[PDB]
Design a protein around this ligand. Structure first.
Ligand code: AGS
Ligand code: AGS
Ligand code: AGS
Ligand code: MG
Ligand code: MG
Ligand code: MG
Lengths: 735, 485
């Protein structure tokens, strides 16, 4: 039917009165950016909005904020009709009232703090019956438009009168709160959130459709990841955005009950959910109820486990119910639960990446007034090893710091703290740097999986090797069809070998960056850390996380460290298992394995077998051209004098490794800083009785050159040159 | 199981009691105990008095079938070893059925069952999918089909835009499942049983292996004849040797040969690489090794292949590798000649293989597999490039002459490497047309120029020193049981 009908989608402009279409659709229904559009949703409600163009928006979809989304009584995936509305006229009076539960903690002049800057210069199209949201004074309050003089909808011009008559109204039964959790409250893990969204939309959102079809949906989705990553958060969001009934099972609470009551509460939970289908039963801290079969020693505890198992099987009802569960330790869960027909789907909600943490930070600073000096992206880059909860907490603590120092002044009369005072409250970048020092990040020891920021431009020379890496890794990803036509499947892995400090580690990260694929680094020593017993299970989890992160490059660095320890029964079991995991790794899975070693003489020939690390790429010391590129790359970030001759520098340093060059750069720079520090003191002495000299000069290099030493001896090189010729012969007898 | 064990103490014993009474009542009957290990695990694992009672309770009812009212008791479990052996006694659960993981052909069958009701697109080729979904189990396939179906629905949400909870076979029947919808569900697949040892007939034939013709026939002597012609061996009064040992330089087709001979006899095949065996814990290893020989018995006639034995020999000087090999030695002797179970070993290092393996009755058939002659090298190069679109210009006899000393694997390297230039060229040619367009003619063929670069960059895997020793060992391998030097 008609073109005006459109599908609801996530928002990009967090602004309430803004909806977005594609320019091809904005042309189709003949609307432009300024236009005010009228939206008709379900439950016979209307909302009016400013339309805009959005390059990301698919033409059959309409991006609307969750505020708009609620006013229509609509959710993601539903259909709404959009139509131009030039008939909108400026208001005389608008009468908005707050909702009690969103203000009962806060006092002051609601009209002057929130409505004022919200409508000022905003020209917001509003509608009678709409509920809009204003964030400020570290609080978010929602007002409902009770009346407009040009009803039902009017624009809010500066001329318009806006009144609030004191006492707030209660929430209507149908009016979902915006204080509630949503997808816009979760960041940095889109990919996982997508999979969860996929599995659950079809059965929950369209229940009759799935009962009629007779094909099986997922019923048990298991969320796992480190603590505080937002597992409990996600479950609530999915339930609210789909509008499904949400029944919470808090692990500890169930297991805190008597024997009989525990099994009972489980039964009641499932029964009530089947009753109010569609629903999500969420089991938080599952390992509390159902740990490994051995550790469950204590018989009543085993009864509860089986009880749960019967209830999960009890989804024979298939009343449109999904059971979600969260756990810190996937390994702790009774494997009986991860059986088919129960918790069959697993989502790794990992630690957030750099961009992710930034996103998180933005969500928990929404309501706070931040000073201009605050650069959350900087905070984001510094907060490595931080998890969602760490960030949410540090944001809270940075706020409480800003509160305390600003309450030193208010303390002269602590009785009257107002919202007006709260909006005046600014949060300095210092308040954040403060919270950083006070932060106790949990996930520093967690294995990180993200796309590296080392690019080709950080690596000097080896240009043709970069291209061979593009052949081996990038082409089979971006051009699978092409490999199919030639009838060849690509090699699984590569082995870097060469003298120390030539860029083997950089290359592994480099090719990853080019392919925009995830990266996993595993150093030799890291593998010898695992207890004798633990090692077997930990290796398997590594290859599993590589699958999760496909397309992914798995890099085993510093293999020399392991090779030493074997010729040692511990290190041996590890590698044999790594070998086994490679073979189990299907080539089709888009998981690429790279090895690196400074010791090609002792590497296990079994690794070099066809199908494993069969691509033997030798990485030698840099020649004269490369040495220039290396020195340039490292010193990009450094303020260098035009005096410095690097090509002359290159010839002098023949025999030096890539690392040996960064050695000279750092050594020369430390003199430059040494000079900068001793000069500030001299300037200090001169004032006691403005033109600093921050730039590195020729003698600094000439001094560093004077003390520079070589990491790779000549005898070592001559052997390395030989191994470049005979490495592939090691599968026979020892060369 | 879980339902029983979720109930009160008394109710559990009662329900077990009630269950048997009902079966004898309405005989003939089947009592099905699903997830048996839930009720009766190994007695040590069952600390807690009532849990042991239920086991004993169950055991008595099983003894209680002395009634012989025509009642059969069936039971299912994930972990056979977890069951209290007291149940596996005669007069109780006396018959056991190994429902293994499906093989290639099996998976194909399964897929067909779960595509029964779906309108499958014309492009869909399940046999490819069957071959692609290795390590998948019946339920994995059941899900994959289910997920591929929901993908086809997922793609057709323009139709769902109706959003009305309305059924309409008209649109529903039009709904097809493309091969892409399978490939999507394939990438999203969570295969469980990849770690399981697979038992099937290999798809590698003689024709996939170039040369080594006389070795193929000796495998027919050793394997096929005692299978296809037991009577001849019987009248002549000799029973044949149990197993074979392949030894030679790396990449000559030892892994392929084992699978090839399996294919010819249409007999089951079990591959176990060295590293795979060293992964098992000291303790765990002992039961899994027995498990291998048992599944070999299950699948008789079967060829049991232990690959990359060099990896194990290396590791013993290791308390694991010592027990592993020593236990395998014991299992071979326990292998009765009558069982039609043939054991083949492979190693790239005959210098370090344990002499005990070479004793009569074990791997006493010492087959040396050397570098491929010119004849073989041509056949190999064709074999590898069958599946690829090659130019008529390409001279394989020329490549064969260039590659004297090269192993069979060294030839596939050249074939694959020549292809690597061709693909980058194919991509780099399309980019060139795209930049010219910005201001049906591509070349779907691998060419001599690609081969000429790959030949120039080609490498030899086997050194002369390596070859000369392999040649010496070919005559003196059987002497390693005495004093070795
Ligand atoms: N990805 C995220 N985006 C936004 N906020 C997050 C995110 N992850 C965690 N948080 C915050 O962390 C806090 C705790 O979230 P929870 O869901 O309870 O953590 P969790 O994953 O359930 O960890 P538990 O309690 O050990 S299972 C919430 O207040 C969130 O705001
Ligand atoms: N090609 C290069 N370009 C720029 N810097 C390099 C290059 N090669 C080595 N380096 C420097 O040496 C450091 C470490 O190099 P790696 O990537 O780790 O090489 P490697 O072969 O793994 O040697 P090691 O033993 O790990 S240092 C880097 O941090 C660089 O500063
Ligand atoms: N006679 C041959 N015919 C066809 N391909 C061969 C032949 N010999 C070696 N190859 C190739 O080399 C690869 C590996 O050979 P294998 O069957 O594994 O023998 P191998 O003795 O076990 O050598 P390795 O150490 O396992 S590579 C195969 O995938 C083939 O592509
Ligand atoms: Mg929680
Ligand atoms: Mg390094
Ligand atoms: Mg092999």
């Amino acid at each position: 039917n008609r073109p005006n009908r459109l599908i609801v989608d996530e928002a990009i402009n967090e602004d309430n009165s803004v909806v977005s279409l594609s320019q091809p659709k904005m042309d189709e229904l003949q609307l432009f950016r300024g236009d005010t559009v009228l939206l008709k949703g379900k439950k016979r409600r209307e909302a009016v909005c400013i339309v805009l163009s959005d390059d990301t928006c698919s033409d059959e979809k309409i991006r609307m904020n969750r505020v708009v989304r609620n006013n229509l009584r609509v959710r993601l995936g539903d259909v709404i009709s959009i139509q131009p509305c030039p008939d909108v006229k400026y208001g005389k009076r608008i009468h908005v009232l707050p909702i009690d539960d969103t203000v009962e903690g806060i006092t002051g002049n609601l009209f002057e703090v929130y409505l004022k800057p919200y409508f000022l210069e905003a020209y917001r199209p509003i509608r009678k019956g709409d509920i809009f949201l204003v964030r400020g004074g570290m609080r978010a309050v929602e007002f409902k438009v009770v009346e407009t003089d040009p009803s039902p909808y009017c624009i809010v011009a500066p001329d318009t009168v806006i009144h609030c008559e004191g006492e707030p109204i209660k929430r209507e039964d149908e009016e979902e709160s915006l204080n509630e959790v949503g997808y816009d409250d979760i960041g940095g893990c889109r990919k996982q959130l997508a999979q969860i969204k996929e599995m659950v939309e079809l059965p929950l959102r369209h229940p009759a459709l799935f009962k009629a079809i007779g094909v099986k949906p997922p019923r048990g989705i298991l969320l796992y990841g480190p603590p505080g990553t937002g597992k409990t958060l996600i479950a609530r969001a999915v339930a609210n955005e789909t509008g499904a009934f949400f029944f919470l099972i808090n692990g500890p609470e169930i297991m805190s009950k008597l024997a009989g009551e525990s099994e009972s509460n489980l039964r009641k939970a499932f029964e009530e959910a089947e009753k109010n289908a569609p629903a999500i039963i969420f089991i938080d801290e599952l390992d509390a109820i159902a740990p490994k079969r051995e550790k469950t020693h204590g018989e009543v505890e085993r009864r509860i486990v089986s009880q749960l198992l019967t209830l999960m099987d009890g989804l024979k009802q298939r009343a449109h119910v999904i059971v979600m569960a969260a756990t810190n330790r996937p390994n702790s869960i009774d494997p009986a639960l991860r059986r088919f027909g129960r918790f069959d789907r697993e989502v790794d909600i990992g630690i957030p990446d750099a961009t992710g943490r930034l996103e998180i930070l933005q969500i928990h600073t929404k309501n706070m007034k931040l000073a201009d000096d605050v650069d959350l992206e900087q905070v984001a880059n510094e907060t490595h090893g931080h998890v969602g909860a760490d960030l949410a907490a540090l944001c809270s603590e940075a706020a409480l710091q800003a509160i305390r120092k600003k309450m030193d002044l208010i303390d002269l009369e602590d009785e009257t703290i107002d919202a007006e005072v709260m909006n005046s409250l600014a949060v300095t970048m210092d308040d954040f740097r403060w919270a950083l020092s006070q932060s106790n990040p949990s996930a520093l020891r967690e294995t990180v999986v993200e796309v590296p920021q080392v690019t080709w431009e950080d690596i000097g020379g080896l240009e043709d090797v970069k291209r061979e890496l593009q052949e081996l890794v990038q082409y089979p990803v971006e051009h699978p069809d092409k490999f199919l036509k030639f009838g060849m499947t690509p090699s699984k892995g590569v082995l870097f070998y060469g003298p120390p400090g030539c860029g083997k580690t950089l290359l592994a990260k480099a090719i990853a960056n080019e392919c925009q694929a995830n990266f996993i680094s595993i150093k030799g020593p890291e593998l010898l850390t695992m207890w004798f017993g633990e090692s077997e299970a930990n290796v398997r989890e590594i290859f599993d996380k590589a699958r999760q992160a496909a397309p992914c490059v798995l890099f085993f660095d510093e293999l020399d460290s392991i090779a030493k320890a074997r010729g040692g029964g511990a290190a041996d079991r590890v590698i044999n298992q790594i070998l086994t995991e490679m073979d189990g790794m299907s080539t089709k899975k888009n998981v690429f394995i790279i090895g690196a070693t400074n010791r090609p003489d002792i590497i296990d020939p079994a690794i070099l077998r066809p199908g494993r690390l069969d691509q033997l790429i030798y990485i030698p010391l840099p020649d004269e051209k490369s040495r220039v590129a290396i020195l340039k790359a490292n010193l990009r970030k450094s303020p260098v004098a035009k005096d410095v001759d690097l090509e002359f520098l290159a010839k002098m340093t023949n025999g030096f490794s890539g690392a040996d060059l960064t050695e000279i750069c750092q050594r020369a720079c430390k003199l430059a800083i040494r000079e900068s520090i001793e000069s500030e003191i001299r300037r200090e002495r001169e004032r006691q009785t403005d033109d600093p000299v921050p730039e590195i000069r020729r003698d600094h290099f000439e001094e560093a050159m004077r003390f520079a030493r070589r990491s790779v001896s000549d005898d070592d090189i001559d052997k390395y040159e030989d191994f470049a010729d005979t490495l592939q012969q090691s599968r026979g007898f020892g060369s």
